[PDB]
Design a protein around this ligand. Structure first.
Ligand SMILES: [Ca+2]
Lengths: 125, 124, 118, 125
């Protein structure tokens, strides 16, 4: 699962970028982290990300063409890997070492017996 | 998995009663009653115009809600993450594992029996 | 996989319902199967299903409150089961049965030793 | 995983179609690959694909009824198969022969004991 960190870096970073870039023009979505976070959560969610944010951004900032497309990909490519990361961390460790406690003592037991039958081998001398 | 089914129907239930408490004054449309707060939260659950269409417009008068929506979404998707995957595991489908701790944990018993049988014939 | 049928029944049926119901008021989305199919594909997709279709429907038809919510659920619950239906239809020794030839004879050996007895 | 190619063909192709078709009427979304790529990414994303693009296209091009519905299906059916393609690939040692070092010597030990008891039960009557 924890990516969870990475994701909260990506999420963190992209916001600070956006708030740097756009906040001048788009204080609505990008004036502060306060809304850049939301906005990128909203973009993460795919609720009116282009038609509602990106295209309208890009109407004055063509460079953002990538900022939105990128973040979406990057985001979904880590949530691809975290959603599947809990598919594997749910599908199974321990069954190994409890029968090396048995066997590596059962052996010890037979050495004990062998020197107890052999203690009555010393036993006649 | 369907232990969650309950939980989810609590989350779903609860969040609605909150919203209907909060917003219904301002947003009777989406929040006037459970009747529509249930829908609305289903709709927010669905991610069809949740922010642009509900939340941001809520938040225009209630900055409080900033979390109410973001939260519910997360909470919801994190239980449906776990229920959808809960049906991935409840669908997917051995014994010889505990059958060699029945061997070893009796083979041991056998060597103790021998050790007190070799030891039983030591006194003699 | 083939549910594929069922789904195409659900999908089929719900359209014929909607086109019966709404087409009067909402010929836009429901005037014919032609657009009721699309519309229900669009509702299946969760692109402006409520805000864009359902709520606006329901503004004159409160009965639809279920028609949309229902279809969505029903749909996702069959696509839940078909997408997972391809997760299972897609997921396609002696080292374990040997250590019960060593052990179930090593035992025999210790019984043989133990019947070392006067 | 790599479909990744196929997908980038589908994605590529459909854009060139759309840009052929619509870029007369809808230079907005279809004037160049530049925006037909985005647009098809946006349609891939299911953010206002019909209500925002397709229906509005189709208001003048009933042809497109399929172009959108098709691409969506085709897209999601390859991403169905690539997302599940990573459920099987990045999802799905030695202790095996380490307990035949134990067992195939523990046996040796019991033969050693058996000829050691053979030693002294013989050697004590
Ligand atoms: Ca949507």
């Amino acid at each position: 699962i924890a990516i969870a960190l990475l994701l909260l870096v990506i999420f963190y970073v992209f916001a600070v970028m956006g708030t740097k870039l756009f906040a001048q023009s788009f204080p609505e979505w990008f004036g502060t982290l306060g809304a850049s976070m939301y906005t990128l959560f909203q973009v993460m969610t795919l609720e009116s990300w282009s038609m509602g944010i990106a295209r309208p951004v890009i109407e004055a900032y063509p460079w953002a063409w990538i900022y939105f497309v990128s973040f979406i990909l990057v985001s979904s490519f880590t949530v691809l890997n975290l959603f599947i990361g809990i598919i594997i961390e749910s599908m199974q460790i321990e069954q190994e070492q409890r029968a090396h406690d048995e066997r590596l003592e059962m052996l010890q037991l037979i050495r004990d017996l062998s020197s107890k039958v052999d203690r009555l081998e010393r036993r006649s001398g």
